[PDB]
Design a protein around this motif. Structure first.
Motif, PDB file in Angstrom:
ATOM      1  N   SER A  93       0.843  -1.225   0.000  1.00 37.37           N
ATOM      2  CA  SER A  93       0.000   0.000   0.000  1.00 37.37           C
ATOM      3  C   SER A  93       0.870   1.264   0.000  1.00 37.37           C
ATOM      4  CB  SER A  93      -0.949   0.019   1.175  1.00 37.37           C
ATOM      5  OG  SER A  93      -0.300   0.499   2.342  1.00 37.37           O
ATOM      6  N   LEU A  94       0.461   2.257  -0.793  1.00 36.42           N
ATOM      7  CA  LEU A  94       1.073   3.607  -0.837  1.00 36.42           C
ATOM      8  C   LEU A  94       0.362   4.466   0.205  1.00 36.42           C
ATOM      9  CD1 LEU A  94       1.724   4.595  -4.554  1.00 36.42           C
ATOM     10  CD2 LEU A  94       3.299   4.835  -2.631  1.00 36.42           C
ATOM     11  N   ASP A  95       1.134   5.195   1.009  1.00 34.98           N
ATOM     12  CA  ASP A  95       0.639   6.094   2.083  1.00 34.98           C
ATOM     13  C   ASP A  95       1.533   7.341   2.070  1.00 34.98           C
ATOM     14  OD1 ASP A  95      -0.856   3.592   3.887  1.00 34.98           O
ATOM     15  OD2 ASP A  95       1.040   3.092   2.901  1.00 34.98           O
ATOM     16  N   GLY A  96       1.094   8.407   1.394  1.00 33.97           N
ATOM     17  CA  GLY A  96       1.896   9.622   1.146  1.00 33.97           C
ATOM     18  C   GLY A  96       3.192   9.298   0.418  1.00 33.97           C
ATOM     19  N   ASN A  97       4.334   9.545   1.064  1.00 33.25           N
ATOM     20  CA  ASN A  97       5.691   9.305   0.507  1.00 33.25           C
ATOM     21  C   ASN A  97       6.210   7.937   0.974  1.00 33.25           C
ATOM     22  OD1 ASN A  97       5.711  11.868  -0.761  1.00 33.25           O
ATOM     23  ND2 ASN A  97       6.457  12.832   1.115  1.00 33.25           N
ATOM     24  N   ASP A  98       5.345   7.109   1.580  1.00 35.89           N
ATOM     25  CA  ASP A  98       5.695   5.770   2.128  1.00 35.89           C
ATOM     26  C   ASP A  98       5.106   4.668   1.240  1.00 35.89           C
ATOM     27  OD1 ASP A  98       6.877   7.122   4.231  1.00 35.89           O
ATOM     28  OD2 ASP A  98       5.538   6.330   5.776  1.00 35.89           O
ATOM     29  N   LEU A  99       5.864   3.585   1.044  1.00 32.14           N
ATOM     30  CA  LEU A  99       5.394   2.317   0.431  1.00 32.14           C
ATOM     31  C   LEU A  99       5.577   1.203   1.467  1.00 32.14           C
ATOM     32  CD1 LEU A  99       6.165   1.149  -3.196  1.00 32.14           C
ATOM     33  CD2 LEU A  99       5.831  -0.410  -1.271  1.00 32.14           C
TER      34      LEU A  99
END
Ligand SMILES: [Co+2]
Ligand SMILES: [Co+2]
Ligand code: NA
Ligand code: NA
Lengths: 170, 170
Positions: A93-99
């Protein structure tokens, strides 16, 4: 409700988790289960009034962070190819600038190898990596008892994770 | 038990599901939850004596099949890059010559686009693809009522999937 009894939230950040839970409650959700490798996020889910938790005992969450999405994806893709070959089940899952990459169903030596490749891949693609969970089986047993003391009623575990942990206990 | 109350099995084949459930019961597992896009697999989980199910209402499982793992991985990687960019949560796993991709949290038009790319990618890399679920919200509501009539006690749904379905109902 008409579509089910329980909504599952995969929580990677305490604040994001609390915001998600509040959004679902406003839409009329009655029971919300929280899934995390992070024991502090699951304790916060109980404090907020939840009692169904999904734990990760033998596995881990790898989190790549960086402003270039194509660099996060190149790092993630190498992790995915390796983890699948080792027989692991993956959640992404993508969460802002986080994978975020939740990995279960690999033994301790393979988890160790994947955690090392995560560090190497982060340096290659010029991004940062965080690892959550990866604890030994004794830490898992301790943290589950703590969740129960804090009022967890139903604790769920992935079958592949549970089988790895049972083999490790023996 | 000491590690949790419920084991989660992601079932992609009725026979593989029944074998997995029997293996966990022999290891002393007491409650087994079954997750599938395939309504027939969840009905078979109830018939076997389960009563906790994880459904996929608005999303789908894409299954690539082929003898060349590197070709399955090239097809899967393009699906993963697209699905993450559209904001979907993905679950991946290798099962013999099959690569299974469970996709939730994208609206109907985006699910339609991803299903088309799956067909195209399969033709490019010389492999076969199967799509399971992808039903409209009325089919989901009907199939959940059927699971309840067949003795489901707890039905879980991914929060992102539930939010897509609630927006679609309105
Ligand atoms: Co999970
Ligand atoms: Co799932
Ligand atoms: Na690699
Ligand atoms: Na693509």
């Amino acid at each position: 409700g008409a579509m089910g009894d329980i909504l599952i939230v995969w929580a990677k950040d305490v604040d994001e988790m609390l915001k998600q839970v509040e959004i679902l409650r406003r839409l009329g959700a009655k029971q919300i289960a929280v899934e995390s490798s992070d024991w502090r996020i699951l304790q916060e889910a109980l404090k907020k009034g939840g009692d169904i938790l999904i734990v990760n005992g033998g596995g881990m969450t790898i989190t790549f962070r960086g402003d270039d999405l194509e660099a996060l994806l190149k790092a993630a893709i190498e992790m995915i190819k390796q983890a699948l070959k080792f027989g692991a089940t993956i959640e992404l899952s993508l969460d802002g600038n986080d994978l975020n990459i939740n990995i279960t169903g690999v033994p301790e030596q393979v988890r160790k190898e994947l955690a090392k490749e995560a560090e190497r891949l982060a340096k290659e693609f010029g991004i940062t990596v965080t690892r959550t969970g990866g604890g030994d089986v004794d830490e898992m047993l301790k943290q589950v008892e703590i969740l129960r003391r804090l009022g967890a009623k139903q604790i769920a575990v992935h079958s592949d994770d549970w089988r790895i942990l049972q083999e490790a206990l023996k």
